[PDB]
Design a protein around this ligand. Sequence first.
Ligand SMILES: *[C@@H]1O[C@H](CO)[C@@H](O[C@@H]2O[C@H](CO)[C@@H](O)[C@H](O)[C@H]2NC(C)=O)[C@H](O)[C@H]1NC(C)=O
Ligand SMILES: *[C@@H]1O[C@H](CO)[C@@H](O[C@@H]2O[C@H](CO)[C@@H](O)[C@H](O)[C@H]2NC(C)=O)[C@H](O)[C@H]1NC(C)=O
Ligand SMILES: *[C@@H]1O[C@H](CO)[C@@H](O[C@@H]2O[C@H](CO)[C@@H](O)[C@H](O)[C@H]2NC(C)=O)[C@H](O)[C@H]1NC(C)=O
Ligand SMILES: *[C@@H]1O[C@H](CO)[C@@H](O[C@@H]2O[C@H](CO)[C@@H](O)[C@H](O)[C@H]2NC(C)=O)[C@H](O)[C@H]1NC(C)=O
Ligand SMILES: *[C@@H]1O[C@H](CO)[C@@H](O[C@@H]2O[C@H](CO)[C@@H](O)[C@H](O)[C@H]2NC(C)=O)[C@H](O)[C@H]1NC(C)=O
Ligand code: NAG
Ligand code: NAG
Lengths: 50, 49, 50, 170, 99
Amino acid sequence: LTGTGVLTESNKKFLPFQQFGRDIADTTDAVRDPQTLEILDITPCSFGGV
Amino acid sequence: SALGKLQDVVNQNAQALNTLVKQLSSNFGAISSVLNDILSRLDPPEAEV
Amino acid sequence: YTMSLGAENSVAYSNNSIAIPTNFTISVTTEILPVSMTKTSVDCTMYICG
Amino acid sequence: DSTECSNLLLQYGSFCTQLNRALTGIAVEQDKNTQEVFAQVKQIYKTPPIKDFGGFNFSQILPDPSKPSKRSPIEDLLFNKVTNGLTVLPPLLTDEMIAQYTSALLAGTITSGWTFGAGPALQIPFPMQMAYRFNGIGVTQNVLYENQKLIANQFNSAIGKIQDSLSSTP
Amino acid sequence: FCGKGYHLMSFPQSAPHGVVFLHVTYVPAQEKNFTTAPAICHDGKAHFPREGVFVSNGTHWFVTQRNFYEPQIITTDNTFVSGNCDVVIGIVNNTVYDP
Ligand SMILES: *[C@@H]1O[C@H](CO)[C@@H](O[C@@H]2O[C@H](CO)[C@@H](O)[C@H](O)[C@H]2NC(C)=O)[C@H](O)[C@H]1NC(C)=O
Ligand SMILES: *[C@@H]1O[C@H](CO)[C@@H](O[C@@H]2O[C@H](CO)[C@@H](O)[C@H](O)[C@H]2NC(C)=O)[C@H](O)[C@H]1NC(C)=O
Ligand SMILES: *[C@@H]1O[C@H](CO)[C@@H](O[C@@H]2O[C@H](CO)[C@@H](O)[C@H](O)[C@H]2NC(C)=O)[C@H](O)[C@H]1NC(C)=O
Ligand SMILES: *[C@@H]1O[C@H](CO)[C@@H](O[C@@H]2O[C@H](CO)[C@@H](O)[C@H](O)[C@H]2NC(C)=O)[C@H](O)[C@H]1NC(C)=O
Ligand SMILES: *[C@@H]1O[C@H](CO)[C@@H](O[C@@H]2O[C@H](CO)[C@@H](O)[C@H](O)[C@H]2NC(C)=O)[C@H](O)[C@H]1NC(C)=O
Ligand SMILES: *[C@@H]1O[C@H](CO)[C@@H](O)[C@H](O)[C@H]1NC(C)=O
Ligand SMILES: *[C@@H]1O[C@H](CO)[C@@H](O)[C@H](O)[C@H]1NC(C)=O
């Protein structure tokens, strides 16, 4: 699973089966890292109009 | 329901934005709706298609 | 049901009678008119391609 | 009815929902337009059975009791002169109720002046209503009263010429 | 255009992406029947109201403003003379007071 974003700590209480999370657009918003099983939130990097 | 004329405009604009965001989830006949999946799965001659 | 258009009123017309008001009501009514929308801008390249 | 076509059409998402919603908005907008145009009165007025309006003739614009559609002769001529997933929704107001609304508006503006549009319908004789309208355009009441027969004859002749011009122009 | 009734004034109010107009209007109420005439015949002359309308409560004739009942004595100050009584259809006989 590929993508770009800032990985931060999260407070979303994922259930044991649950691995990733999806927004309305279906783009991945949170992910569970292998090897260490922790839950990393994925926040898109800051952008806007010049 | 006194202020329905303004709420109608707000709901129409929010629904248009939600539809435009929702349209990214459609693959439109492709193998996937995610561009990164296509770019990581296929060679550029068929990933171009 | 078949909807009614209004309460039926028959105006007491005759060729030499008039109706003159003897009192009045100061009536305040609301009229709601939209003026503007939310100003939305879409980055076309980022929306199509990211 | 092709199921493979609909399975391929589900790949394009909610295009059909947007088209149906836009057409539904147009369909309710037409009923809103008719509601705003014709339903400007909440009282259904009737003319008196005796049509004594000081020589003024409204038979070409008042509803004809002999016709089952309850239309005016002018309105009857107007209605005579107009000739795969597709559905046509009927309008919310039928032509009989639109004719009833126009009949109520005509009865209000004949029997009550402009008073029914601003409040309760206050009755007034039609040669007095006409004099008030004459004073609205800056002509004295006496001019209307002295020449009331000529104005009534001119009005009846003009209404007949309107019916003749509508019947003679395609 | 500015509410139902005779428009007096209006107040604007801001609203989210909109405007709200408070239309203050005048609505007539408590109407009463009166017997009316187009003109008053007096001394062989026809008298017409300058701004009002001739009304009668049954025995006496008055002139009042059109949108509010305020009966006043039919005088020369509030009437004007045009022609004789032979032309106007529905002219009635009543005295016209001279101040
Ligand atoms: C003015 O007089 C007319 C007739 O004298 C009144 O009209 C009548 O009103 C009553 C009350 O609703 C009805 O039952 C009658 O059928 C009406 N008759 C006609 C011929 O319309 C009218 O109400 C009077 N106006 C006022 C303000 O009192
Ligand atoms: C004109 O109408 C007003 C109300 O719109 C009348 O005022 C009311 O009069 C009654 C009895 O006199 C009182 O009990 C109410 O409290 C009054 N209401 C208000 C808001 O003041 C007024 O009397 C009427 N005048 C005429 C001449 O009919
Ligand atoms: C008002 O106008 C109508 C039609 O414009 C008149 O009705 C006509 O009457 C004459 C003789 O009475 C007939 O020969 C015509 O055939 C009638 N025309 C129609 C269309 O029916 C009516 O007489 C006029 N006056 C009144 C008081 O109603
Ligand atoms: C019509 O109005 C006039 C004037 O307002 C009334 O005449 C007055 O009536 C009162 C009541 O009896 C008397 O006290 C006055 O003396 C009368 N004035 C004059 C100049 O005579 C008249 O009664 C009213 N008529 C009706 C049927 O209401
Ligand atoms: C109004 O007054 C006029 C004049 O005072 C009346 O006309 C008179 O009527 C009588 C009988 O009808 C005749 O003998 C006179 O010759 C007429 N005089 C004039 C100058 O025309 C008229 O009848 C009165 N109308 C009412 C309704 O009372
Ligand atoms: C390796 O991944 C597994 C999950 O499949 C995990 O249980 C284990 O702790 C991981 N070990 C190390 C050394 O990361
Ligand atoms: C009003 O009609 C009556 C008949 O109902 C008649 O006697 C009277 O002269 C008419 N008045 C006017 C001003 O036309």
